[PDB]
Design a protein around this ligand. Sequence first.
Ligand code: HEC
Ligand code: HEC
Lengths: 129, 129
Amino acid sequence: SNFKEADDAIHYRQSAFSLMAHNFGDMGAMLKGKKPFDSEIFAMRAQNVAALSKLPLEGFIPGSDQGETEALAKIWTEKSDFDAKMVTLQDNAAALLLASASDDKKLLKQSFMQVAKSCKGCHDVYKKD
Amino acid sequence: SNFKEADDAIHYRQSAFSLMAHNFGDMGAMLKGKKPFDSEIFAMRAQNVAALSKLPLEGFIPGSDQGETEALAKIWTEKSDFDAKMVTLQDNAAALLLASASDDKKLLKQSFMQVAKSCKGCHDVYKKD
Ligand code: HEC
Ligand code: HEC
């Protein structure tokens, strides 16, 4: 068992998502002009998102749908699809990290959008309203 | 500013340390025989620790020594020493990541020990008792 209690796995996955969101949202703000675009900071943010996208899945242990969590129970009865959506987030995030090595803003925006689709798509199905 | 409020910066750096501890402790348990050693998991842990070690510094914004934190105000009056300690944690994490590419248990333990000193060394000076 990777966690002592269900409440440690919830906090772990919640912390992971939160930190990913902080780094993802900064890339969104730079791409929308809410804050100046910076190639080096954007690349750091993309690296952080790629790495942090590999953390939360470990936290979705059996029985951790009870408690102070927004995870829906259907996650575990459809864990194969949930797992697939998490792998595709990782893949998309690795692609955004690659796009940050290029100077093509089309590419950055496109791979960013694909990653944003992954956050959104999973929340729509597997996160409480 | 990267954070709207000081409390968001505290929560960010605390989450990063929290995820780091979970990953660092799993490596400790494997190196101490508290749980089966797994080279593939161990390497993932080492990768996770190195990536996570690059995150918390951003959360140490000025004025965030007040709030729901265990950080000492001293961090800000000795910020370059604190920063140097964070970089050395990154250095040691990178060496632990490299060591994880080998099967030399002694080198694994030494590398793990070197990271452990960094955690403890900084806590001893800059985290409340
Ligand atoms: C399923 C395959 C997901 C992917 C892809 C993404 N997220 Fe998500 N997120 C998911 C769940 C099931 C939960 C609830 C966790 C819980 O135990 O309550 C979340 C939660 C978040 C949160 C809130 C975390 C918190 O502080 O409580 C955030 C900010 C968040 N998720 C962001 C986020 C982003 C930015 C993503 C794309 C980079 C993303 N998630 C993908 C499920 C899934
Ligand atoms: C200084 C350069 C540090 C290094 C190196 C490490 N840690 Fe630390 N940690 C530091 C501070 C100043 C704080 C308090 C932050 C706050 O605002 O309260 C912490 C906190 C932690 C915690 C508690 C996190 C929480 O849930 O509130 C943990 C579990 C932790 N740190 C673990 C940890 C590990 C495993 C480290 C080595 C890999 C490590 N820290 C290094 C300062 C510094």
